[PDB]
Design a protein around this nucleic acid. Sequence first.
RNA 1: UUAAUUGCGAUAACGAACGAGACCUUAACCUACUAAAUAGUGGUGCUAGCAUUUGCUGGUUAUCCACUUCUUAGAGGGACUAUCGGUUUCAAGCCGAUGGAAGUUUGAGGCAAUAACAGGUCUGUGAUGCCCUUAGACGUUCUGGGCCGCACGCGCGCUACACUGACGGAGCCAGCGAGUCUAACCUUGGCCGAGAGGUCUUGGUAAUCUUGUGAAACUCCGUCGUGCUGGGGAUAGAGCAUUGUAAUUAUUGCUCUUCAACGAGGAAUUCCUAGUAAGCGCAAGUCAUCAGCUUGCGUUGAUUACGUCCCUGCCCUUUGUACACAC
Lengths: 67, 135, 61, 145, 70, 79, 206, 143
Amino acid sequence: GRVRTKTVKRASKALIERYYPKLTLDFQTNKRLCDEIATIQSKRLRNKIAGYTTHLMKRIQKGPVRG
Amino acid sequence: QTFGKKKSATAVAHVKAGKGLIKVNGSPITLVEPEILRFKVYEPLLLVGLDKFSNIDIRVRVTGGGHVSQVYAIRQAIAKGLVAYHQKYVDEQSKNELKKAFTSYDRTLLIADSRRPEPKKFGGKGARSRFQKSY
Amino acid sequence: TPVTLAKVIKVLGRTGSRGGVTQVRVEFLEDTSRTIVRNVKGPVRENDILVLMESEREARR
Amino acid sequence: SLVVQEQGSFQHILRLLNTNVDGNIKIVYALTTIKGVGRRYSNLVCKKADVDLHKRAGELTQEELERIVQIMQNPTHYKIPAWFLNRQNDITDGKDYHTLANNVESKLRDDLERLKKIRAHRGIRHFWGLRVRGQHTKTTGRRRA
Amino acid sequence: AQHAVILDQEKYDRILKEVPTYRYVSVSVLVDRLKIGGSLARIALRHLEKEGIIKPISKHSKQAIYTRAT
Amino acid sequence: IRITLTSTKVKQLENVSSNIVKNAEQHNLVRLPTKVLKISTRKTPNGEGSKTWETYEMRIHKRYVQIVKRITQVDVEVV
Amino acid sequence: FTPVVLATPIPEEVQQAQTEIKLFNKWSFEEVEVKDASLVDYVQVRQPIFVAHTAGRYANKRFRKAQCPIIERLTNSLMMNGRNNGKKLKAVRIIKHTLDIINVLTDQNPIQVVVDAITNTGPREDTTRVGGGGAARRQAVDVSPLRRVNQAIALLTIGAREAAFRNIKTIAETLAEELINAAKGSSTSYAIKKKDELERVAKSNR
Amino acid sequence: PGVSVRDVAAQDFINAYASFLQRQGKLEVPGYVDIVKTSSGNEMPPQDAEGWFYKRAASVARHIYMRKQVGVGKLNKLYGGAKSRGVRPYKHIDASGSINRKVLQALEKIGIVEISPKGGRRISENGQRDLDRIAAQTLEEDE
RNA sequence: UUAAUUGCGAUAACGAACGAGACCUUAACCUACUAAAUAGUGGUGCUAGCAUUUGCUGGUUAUCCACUUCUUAGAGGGACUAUCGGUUUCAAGCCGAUGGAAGUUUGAGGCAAUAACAGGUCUGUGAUGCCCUUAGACGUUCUGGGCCGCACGCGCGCUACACUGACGGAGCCAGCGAGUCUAACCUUGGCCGAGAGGUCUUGGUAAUCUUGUGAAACUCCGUCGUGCUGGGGAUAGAGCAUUGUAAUUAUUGCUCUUCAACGAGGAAUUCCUAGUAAGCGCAAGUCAUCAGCUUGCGUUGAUUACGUCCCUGCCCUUUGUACACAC
Ligand SMILES: [Mg+2]
Ligand SMILES: [Mg+2]
Ligand SMILES: [Mg+2]
Ligand SMILES: [Mg+2]
Ligand SMILES: [Mg+2]
Ligand SMILES: [Mg+2]
Ligand SMILES: [Mg+2]
Ligand SMILES: [Mg+2]
Ligand SMILES: [Mg+2]
Ligand SMILES: [Mg+2]
Ligand SMILES: [Mg+2]
Ligand SMILES: [Mg+2]
């Protein structure tokens, strides 16, 4: 049910490489960060990149993530 | 200015200094008579707060649904009514004293029963069920 | 009335060709000290005490 | 209401227009035991013959129900309208009757015979045992004889 | 049995032998006890409700419930 | 004045509503339910196969001196 | 007992039941023990309710109908055999009738002589079908703490359903005349006659 | 104590009060009663037939008081249940028109119903008076 | 690992196209803005009723100001499995919880690939190859019959065997919709009629009017009393209406009367996991008249699983083949 596809996983890590300057462990902050620098179409689209980027961040502290 | 909802029944009320008469539709609450669901409507006030509702703004009218979405709707109006004049009025710790006692028994009084009925697809008299088959 | 008590320590899993039974490890409580694997019919989860008509000789499969 | 006892003036077995009717049965339906007496037309005559409906069949007198036989065979003269009558306007004589006891089958026989001998559709269609009322005949109505 | 529809008294002051060691009484109790049929058992539960030992607990059409002289 | 306007698309329906609350201040001066028309027929042209049904839809949205005759120049109507 | 009133005369009887000690409208929903330790956590007396119609979502997730007020639990297994489907209001009137139909046969809270009538209506062991097929063995397996409940309900409702059918007695009079025996050692109750029937080659097939 | 009909329950008021119009005898009944069912969409004539014009006349005035203006047709829709169409699906069928019209008539022959200036039937000038009157009769011995 | 060729990873493959998903639609909330006799509420002018410090219930067809909570639709907000734990095997994820209108892709749909079938449709096309016919026409029109025809077998359904009922009063609550000018659509209110229905007005091109569609199941009060009964309404008689040039082989509605099988359905077999099953009605298609059909909509609202590969069966590997028109 809840497996995020490469549209999010590619885009979600497409950011962390160019904006680890800033970026946070809190979802709603990245939510309103996303649409400033990205061109996502729908909210659910953006809220799922954000939900995963935040998820990569909530784990980025302890060891880098492959890629 | 409180809501009340079960399915399409909606019930309304209001917030200011009041009367003592608690009015259902026009015929006050005393008897509502889906005979034994009266204790459904009586239910809120009884955990705490049994009186001084002579300064109380309770007119309630119901439209839509049917004989039991309305009973569930009005209690959705009344219960949210009390915690409504406890927002920037007589203290809000009482909001957290009613929202406490109401919701700690919450049979859908503060929070609206989300349950809406499902669109029916063809090949059946139902959203899920289907016509009979013949091989 | 030869009965005995038993609450379920863990659920080993399911068997039965249609899949409607669960293997459970179990014990009787005071001086617990028992462990025997009975198969059970309706839904069952942890700490569900349940009956027994002979204190041992369970089955499997 | 409440309890009475009454003396031994009740009966089962009571023959009225060639048809015996059970007495332990409450009234207005023990009348339907007669052909031509339905429920609409039984419910009415026995109130426009001034009887109390709460009573079972065991009570009453002959002219308490000769109050009803002369009502039933001459109802045109008793304030009951013409749309209550199983035979209105006739076809033999134009005057409105109420076929009863035997009279139902007999003046039904006339209704069928008048068509059967005229070789009307319903006439020889009745004479065959088939449905005169235009219903479908392949899918339905089979086991019978 | 074939059952009955009027109020003589054979076992019908057993209609007054009508309480001890069988507390609950209503239409069904009346017909069963080697006894009456049950449409005069409705005016009768109305009749001893008028002034009898039976007292109403039940306020509804479909079933009446009446007890002993408690 | 009083105008009532209607169309099927919503953009050029609301490019006049705004374009009239701005002629409302032309010298610093003074939503209906959407109607969905449902056609519900069969996908198949003849009679064959699974009996498959298919609703179509039209969406109808409606809303409501020298300057009067030069404001009316989407379904335009005013009284 | 805090009698008090406002512009709408509040009937006195209501004010002296709930706010005095938070009962059910007539019957004391208060302390009633379960005589079978395996229905510890599988019964929902306390929290009390005044009417058996708390329409709530006890199904979309799995075990929750354990937490349903175990009296609304049975008022549901009555509205069936097809015609009665829907019709909760017809059901809840049968129960509040049956309570004092029970209560007019020795007092003390019929809300218990129902649960006292399910702990001895739960089949301890049971026997079901092996892979097999025709030559299939019937290996016994003990019965669930919740199945023993679920099924003694529909077992009890059914016995009343088919005895109210065509017999002079009422439907509230039937299950009342049926719940009572299951309180113990019924030997004359439908659901007991089936639990005891169902324990067949039971402690032998184990 | 300031009693309107809305503060008395419906059934016991509509019924026990409808006996009042019997107590008086200002009747004007149609006399075709004893032959009517109140609808094609039912089967038997009204069980009692010794009354029920009072109950019907009570019923209409209760709704006429409770709201603004009534009509002859809407009476037919209300009381009319479902015709047992035999072996076919049941349907809502309306009620008898002659029955309901002759009660909307015989009630301004008593001073309880008006003929609304907008069309319909207003609760009369003195209707709003005698209806609340039966409340405190019923209420002040029913507590 | 996921519902998923969905992802993590592993890799003689790398990088890419469609399908999945994204998407669009609708159902949930929103006290946030814009706002409103075609939506409401509160107040006030005027008036009925009740008991009287002025309280209940109405009426108030602009009787003036104010509000935008109910209602409508614009702009948007909002959930992303967030957070905490348990879990993993690093992971992808899964499980529990708190929070929340919302946590089964949130619920339900629309869309939907490559390769195929001699699948179905020339009886939808003024789409069409070839054949046949073209004046005693297979063209077309007109009159009248048939498609309904009844020893019988089967498929979808409607109604019921009743006392969780039938009936009679009584209470009285929805939502999706449709509706008239090169015209007679939806119909309120007044009378007449037991009914069906008849009639003189009437409003509406429709958030206004029909319409709160006062629906039905359902709810309160009574009657009936276990047996074919007041369960059941098939069959049939007689009469009155409506549609229509035309009702006969009853179009349909109404009235009275007649009152069959059916006492819970053998082997078999369909559908279904939440506001779902089932019960209940309503509008729309059809349509002059005729719903026991279908497309939807709400009202009442459960029981039972949150599992398996036993049967039926799909997918992916590996395997064997004498199959290739392919068990
Ligand atoms: Mg076959
Ligand atoms: Mg009615
Ligand atoms: Mg009705
Ligand atoms: Mg495809
Ligand atoms: Mg072919
Ligand atoms: Mg051709
Ligand atoms: Mg044909
Ligand atoms: Mg089919
Ligand atoms: Mg009948
Ligand atoms: Mg009824
Ligand atoms: Mg199958
Ligand atoms: Mg068709």
